Symmetry: C3
Subunit: 176 residues, 3 copies
Amino acid sequence: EKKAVIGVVTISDRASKGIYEDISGKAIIDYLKDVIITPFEVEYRVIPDERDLIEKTLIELADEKGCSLILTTGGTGPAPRDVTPEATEAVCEKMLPGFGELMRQVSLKQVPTAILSRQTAGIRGSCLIVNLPGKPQSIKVCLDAVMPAIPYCIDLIGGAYIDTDPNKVKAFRPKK
Amino acid sequence: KKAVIGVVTISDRASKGIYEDISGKAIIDYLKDVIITPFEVEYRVIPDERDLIEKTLIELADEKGCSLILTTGGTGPAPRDVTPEATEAVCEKMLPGFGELMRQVSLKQVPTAILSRQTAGIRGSCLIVNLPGKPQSIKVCLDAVMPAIPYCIDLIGGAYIDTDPNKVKAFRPK
Amino acid sequence: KKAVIGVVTISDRASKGIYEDISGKAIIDYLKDVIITPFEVEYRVIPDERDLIEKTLIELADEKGCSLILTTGGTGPAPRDVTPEATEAVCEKMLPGFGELMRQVSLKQVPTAILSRQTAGIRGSCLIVNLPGKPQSIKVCLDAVMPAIPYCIDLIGGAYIDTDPNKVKAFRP
């Protein structure tokens, strides 16, 4: 059986040179540990806002570390240096428009500027890559919104088996 | 102009063997139930081979004169699901609102609706729309987008289609 | 630094002088009504010709120094409706959330909202947003996206804009 490996990449020129506490990264890893009940390992990376480095990082995680899921945080706004979506589009062979649409929709509730987010999601081999926001409150609503479909998506692309605690988040798996 | 509607079932079972087509059935049943104007159906069941999908859509729009083509199948994240790609390839103008609405109305009952890559686009005077595969989802999606289809077809110079207002209100700013 | 907003009406009728532009005027009125900071308007009424749309958007952003450009017209399914195409052609980064929300908000009124291809993108320090036609559908879309515009402009190095919190709250994290 394939081992479940999950990538968590915090993208920020600032944090890349040092960060006392990666609140965004910690929130994401905390979430995963809480809701997931199947065995899995985390591959954490903190890199700057450099398109080529982000692409190479995602590639290393998916291709070398064998991640079935990679969650990024940061670099998805309208500013010129925010190139996480561009890097994500570049390494994936197929994008999932439903992710960005839903994440912005749930984020909009409390954040009117959620429509400025260029967060997306895509598939590279047997790995799903999802761009999350930076704010803890936004990260939470986005994960609550998309996690229910992640395990099944991973099943469909041949990734590692992941299951969640139905009491926190139920991993929807449609059957024949 | 004669109203011809294409219904294309794209199967990922061409090799495993097809024993039924409940998806195509749901679509044909829907069309017959709501459309009140005369129309014919060009039905195609093809394997999920990208070039064949594009070829089929081009034939239906260009040779068979369809004003609307409805597809089912091959719209998920799996690598073999390339219906959306084929659709983009044959269309000159895409309509993002279709995929958006279809994923939105399907979300409550289908959390995995965000995995769907269904889209919609225009090729000359023909509107092409990707539909899901589950009959229940097909009806839900068609109920959401059919209201704007007849009018969209008018705007691109396609054949006249009108539905039973007691079943589906084809909105026509007129 | 100076706040300049472009308002582009893409219509044949209006460009011929045989139709008053109720759309563009509604946009200008909206801006004058909600903005409380100093700004000027660069108004243009042009035919729906692909090349003229791109050149007008480029003139406004590059030569007139607009930090925001609002277009109206040519965003439907018809083959002549190429405002979105022209917008994509001049922007270096698109904003999918804008089209998503505008269609969302429009669905409330009419189901044909899904036929709209309105979008938005960035060119340098200028934000370009495609608005609807009816002066009424314009107010509705603007009420939905305006809250995030001033801040977007801040992030791309554009001019400072702020609105009347009693009319439209310009959200700034």
